[PDB]
């Protein structure tokens, strides 16, 4: 529930977060930060799956 609920919160923050900037077709710096953080959360969950 740790892993999956933090992935769900990452989804909620990212959906909330996309209302700030316009609908640009390229990746911004906040988009890179959110992507790397989402990757870290997903990596933590898959690591739990492995353990």
């Amino acid at each position: 529930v740790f892993g999956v609920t933090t992935v769900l919160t990452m989804t909620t923050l990212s959906i909330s977060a996309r209302n700030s900037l316009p609908k640009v077709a390229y990746a911004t710096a906040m988009d890179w930060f959110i992507a790397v953080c989402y990757a870290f959360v997903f990596s933590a969950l898959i690591e739990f799956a492995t353990v």
């Binding site: 769900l8 989804t11 909620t12 959906i15």
Partner: protein, 52 residues
Amino acid sequence: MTTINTHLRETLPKIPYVKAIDMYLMGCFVFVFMALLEYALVNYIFFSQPAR
């Protein structure tokens, strides 16, 4: 999936036909739905045989 679908749907008109993005979201939903149903089926015959 439901949260994603409801949050990214209201930025378009109320068009009847199925868009590509609506098709993809419904595909993702049916995939996770059948995954949960598959788990339910695994749990239904878990007490009887663990091999299957």
